[PDB]
Design an enzyme around this catalytic site. Structure first.
Site, mmCIF file in Angstrom:
data_model
loop_
_atom_site.group_PDB
_atom_site.id
_atom_site.type_symbol
_atom_site.label_atom_id
_atom_site.label_comp_id
_atom_site.label_asym_id
_atom_site.label_seq_id
_atom_site.Cartn_x
_atom_site.Cartn_y
_atom_site.Cartn_z
ATOM 1 N N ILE A 1 0.769 -1.202 0.005
ATOM 2 C CA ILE A 1 -0.219 -0.084 -0.014
ATOM 3 C C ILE A 1 0.947 1.368 0.124
ATOM 4 O O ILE A 1 0.538 2.202 -0.970
ATOM 5 C CB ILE A 1 -1.024 0.197 1.228
ATOM 6 N N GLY A 2 1.987 1.329 0.876
ATOM 7 C CA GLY A 2 2.745 2.301 0.958
ATOM 8 C C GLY A 2 4.174 2.226 1.373
ATOM 9 O O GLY A 2 4.256 1.054 2.160
ATOM 10 N N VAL B 1 2.805 -2.150 4.658
ATOM 11 C CA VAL B 1 1.187 -1.992 4.488
ATOM 12 C C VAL B 1 0.806 -2.625 3.461
ATOM 13 O O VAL B 1 1.218 -2.302 2.276
ATOM 14 C CB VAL B 1 0.545 -0.713 4.849
ATOM 15 N N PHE C 1 5.260 4.376 7.318
ATOM 16 C CA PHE C 1 4.348 3.482 7.779
ATOM 17 C C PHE C 1 4.695 2.190 7.933
ATOM 18 O O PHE C 1 4.096 1.477 8.804
ATOM 19 C CB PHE C 1 3.338 3.646 6.552
ATOM 20 N N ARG D 1 1.196 13.272 9.020
ATOM 21 C CA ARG D 1 1.567 12.133 8.575
ATOM 22 C C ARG D 1 0.513 11.089 9.278
ATOM 23 O O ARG D 1 0.348 10.094 8.565
ATOM 24 C CB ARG D 1 2.990 11.741 8.622
ATOM 25 N N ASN D 2 0.350 11.304 10.325
ATOM 26 C CA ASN D 2 -0.522 10.170 11.210
ATOM 27 C C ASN D 2 -1.925 10.500 11.052
ATOM 28 O O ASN D 2 -2.809 9.942 11.853
ATOM 29 C CB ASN D 2 -0.162 10.151 12.690
ATOM 30 N N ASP E 1 -2.631 6.421 15.235
ATOM 31 C CA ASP E 1 -1.655 6.783 16.214
ATOM 32 C C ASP E 1 -0.165 6.267 15.612
ATOM 33 O O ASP E 1 0.831 6.677 16.141
ATOM 34 C CB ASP E 1 -2.084 5.997 17.359
ATOM 35 N N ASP F 1 1.762 11.542 19.745
ATOM 36 C CA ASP F 1 2.487 11.587 18.398
ATOM 37 C C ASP F 1 1.623 12.099 17.176
ATOM 38 O O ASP F 1 1.567 11.671 16.069
ATOM 39 C CB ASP F 1 2.876 9.993 18.164
HETATM 40 C C1 MT3 Z 1 -3.947 3.973 -0.041
HETATM 41 O O1 MT3 Z 1 -3.127 4.649 1.067
HETATM 42 C C2 MT3 Z 1 -3.065 4.177 2.407
HETATM 43 C C3 MT3 Z 1 -4.330 3.775 3.096
HETATM 44 C C4 MT3 Z 1 -4.397 3.418 4.296
HETATM 45 N N1 MT3 Z 1 -5.451 2.790 4.971
HETATM 46 C C5 MT3 Z 1 -5.520 2.494 6.111
HETATM 47 C C6 MT3 Z 1 -4.664 2.519 6.968
HETATM 48 C C7 MT3 Z 1 -3.246 2.879 6.419
HETATM 49 O O2 MT3 Z 1 -2.178 2.723 7.070
HETATM 50 C C8 MT3 Z 1 -2.043 2.723 8.382
HETATM 51 C C9 MT3 Z 1 -2.376 3.528 9.369
HETATM 52 C C10 MT3 Z 1 -2.396 3.247 10.853
HETATM 53 C C11 MT3 Z 1 -1.641 2.051 11.218
HETATM 54 C C12 MT3 Z 1 -1.756 1.810 12.782
HETATM 55 C C13 MT3 Z 1 -2.747 2.141 13.389
HETATM 56 N N2 MT3 Z 1 -2.710 2.131 14.637
HETATM 57 C C14 MT3 Z 1 -1.669 1.485 15.456
HETATM 58 C C15 MT3 Z 1 -1.885 1.428 17.087
HETATM 59 C C16 MT3 Z 1 -2.084 0.050 17.258
HETATM 60 C C17 MT3 Z 1 -1.503 -0.608 18.422
HETATM 61 C C18 MT3 Z 1 -1.806 -2.047 18.931
HETATM 62 C C19 MT3 Z 1 -2.881 -2.599 18.534
HETATM 63 C C20 MT3 Z 1 -3.657 -1.744 17.607
HETATM 64 C C21 MT3 Z 1 -3.243 -0.874 17.068
HETATM 65 N N3 MT3 Z 1 -0.733 0.972 14.608
HETATM 66 C C22 MT3 Z 1 0.721 0.458 15.182
HETATM 67 C C23 MT3 Z 1 -0.593 1.088 13.224
HETATM 68 O O3 MT3 Z 1 0.376 1.011 12.544
HETATM 69 C C24 MT3 Z 1 -1.280 1.165 10.165
HETATM 70 C C25 MT3 Z 1 -1.559 1.294 8.882
HETATM 71 F F1 MT3 Z 1 -1.183 0.665 7.850
HETATM 72 C C26 MT3 Z 1 -3.255 3.223 4.991
HETATM 73 C C27 MT3 Z 1 -1.988 3.885 4.590
HETATM 74 C C28 MT3 Z 1 -1.814 4.333 3.193
HETATM 75 O O4 MT3 Z 1 -0.928 4.716 2.637
HETATM 76 C C29 MT3 Z 1 0.330 4.847 3.175
#
Ligand code: MT3
Ligand code: MT3
Lengths: 276, 275
Positions: A31-32, A39, A36, A155-156, A169, A151
């Site tokens: 995805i990216g 993903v 990130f 970007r977040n 987050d 945080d």
């Molecule tokens: C088409 O473009 C995109 C679409 C996207 N669509 C949905 C999510 C996307 O990215 C994320 C956004 C956030 C997270 C993410 C959220 N929350 C936590 C805390 C956490 C901690 C413990 C348990 C459960 C959750 N973490 C550790 C994370 O990593 C992960 C991701 F992959 C996308 C990214 C994209 O481009 C970069």
């Protein structure tokens, strides 16, 4: 390791755990490729029977029980969050082989920072105030549940197909003054970072403090110096920012205040390319 | 701040929480000052209503939902642990008008480092090795539970009335891979243990007195290790060196360390503190 954790904690986590036979991860469709991590496109079979396109992140770092347990309770917390300006957690996936997965709804337009940075998009002043408004609402909710984001940055923040900003987050140039010296993070410390996020929005994704080193930032802010008014930012919105950058956390506005204030400003503006 | 936490988590924590009606904390009676911050003498009534003399620490930082939730989950983990060489958790106390309290069994002789530094105490070479063997046993157990310590040191070890060492919970103790990857494993613990053994044999001398906290990384990369303590037997200094092998997997396991240190200890006579 699978699930050699405390029975009661495992019992507490079950509503957040996704059965792997209800998830497909396309490890060949990334995805990216940025801050990130890794993903991928996923397809989740929900209990009602709806097949859902989603984003799946692999958590490459976890190993010991302590990490997993920390991770699980972090999952429990995020699962309980319900707000249109806060990114939902669909679930977590624990596997015998490989590190755990985080499963999230698919965001069509990715993260807010990339969306505003690229030339192809032409968001107006109102659009950027709008985006900033939505973040404030997201943070207004989180603050109510007495959760400290810790945080916050453009970007977040995510952006779905309906252009709804979803705070996620997942950083010295975003931190409050007291966070840099006392290591204290509060709801008011998040307010500072929201300020910086507003700067990002009204600059269309410029890097903050481009001419200072990460270590020099502390003394820089103590010289009374602040981020300069962005080209898209109207006078009353810049005054908001400066309040978020007060050195005394208590002086800074609450997120509830920012919502109604920014909203007031937002309504004076017209001309919008990205609505809702 | 009340339990505005997740109900299902609160359900899981219940066995670790102490009802404050079964606890008295003497806030005027301070047990230890420094490193452990503010610890207080306490009295707990157990399930069956027995008075238990304890130490109570106040957690001044823990405030927001995320912090408390983590604190709770960590309590759930510590509470499950049951080994004679690991400090047990009696419970946690969530006060409405004050920061949370951790409740631990009272340790007569405080921390191991403070005990050995004190000139009034006369621990033999066999005594110091014996203490090292008990830490090893605790860490062996912790390792069997897939639990990484992250801050193993003499100052983090407690000593009760029966002179039992209890492992409880920093760069000079950190493994080479920890100082460059922020990565902690049980192999990383083995390193800190080696530095702990060094601490025991020197009777609590500060490690690397001359190299500064920042300079430590290049120092270990260069190849310099801690010198053999004045009163450390050779086979034991050999052990330390194995604990400090730059290749993580080449280091021994705590299970092997128990076996080896047990043998080394068994070849000695003379104890002023018998376990
Ligand atoms: C088409 O473009 C995109 C679409 C996207 N669509 C949905 C999510 C996307 O990215 C994320 C956004 C956030 C997270 C993410 C959220 N929350 C936590 C805390 C956490 C901690 C413990 C348990 C459960 C959750 N973490 C550790 C994370 O990593 C992960 C991701 F992959 C996308 C990214 C994209 O481009 C970069
Ligand atoms: C007579 O002298 C002394 C006797 C003592 N007798 C018992 C305990 C003592 O010190 C402690 C030892 C360990 C702890 C301690 C343990 N484990 C954790 C993890 C944890 C995390 C989350 C939830 C629950 C538990 N924490 C955060 C801790 O603070 C606290 C202490 F106060 C004593 C100290 C003494 O003098 C220095």
């Amino acid at each position: 390791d699978l699930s050699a954790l405390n029975p009661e904690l495992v019992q507490a986590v079950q509503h957040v755990v996704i059965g792997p036979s209800s998830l497909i991860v396309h490890f060949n469709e990334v995805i990216g490729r940025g801050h990130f991590g890794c993903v991928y496109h996923g397809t989740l079979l929900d209990n009602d029977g709806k097949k859902i396109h989603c984003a799946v992140k692999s958590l490459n770092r976890i190993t010991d029980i302590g990490e997993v347990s920390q991770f699980l309770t972090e999952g429990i917390i995020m699962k309980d969050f319900s707000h249109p300006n806060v990114l939902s957690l669909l679930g977590i996936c624990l596997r015998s082989e490989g590190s755990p997965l985080v499963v999230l709804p698919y965001m069509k337009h990715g993260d807010l920072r990339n969306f505003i940075r690229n030339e192809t998009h032409n968001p107006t002043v109102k659009d950027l105030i709008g985006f900033g408004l939505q973040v404030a609402k997201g943070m207004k909710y989180l603050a109510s549940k007495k959760f400290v984001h810790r945080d916050l940055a453009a970007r977040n923040c995510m952006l779905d197909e309906k252009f709804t900003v979803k705070v996620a987050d997942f950083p010295v140039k975003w931190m409050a003054l007291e966070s840099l010296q006392t290591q204290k993070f509060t709801t008011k410390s998040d307010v500072w970072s929201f300020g910086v996020l507003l700067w990002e929005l009204m600059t269309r994704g410029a890097p903050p403090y481009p001419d200072v080193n990460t270590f020099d930032i502390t003394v820089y802010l103590l010289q009374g110096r602040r981020l300069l008014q962005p080209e898209y930012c109207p006078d009353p919105l810049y005054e908001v920012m400066l309040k978020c950058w007060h050195p005394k956390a208590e002086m800074r506005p609450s997120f509830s205040e920012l919502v109604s204030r920014i909203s007031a400003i937002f309504s004076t503006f017209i001309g919008e390319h990205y609505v809702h």
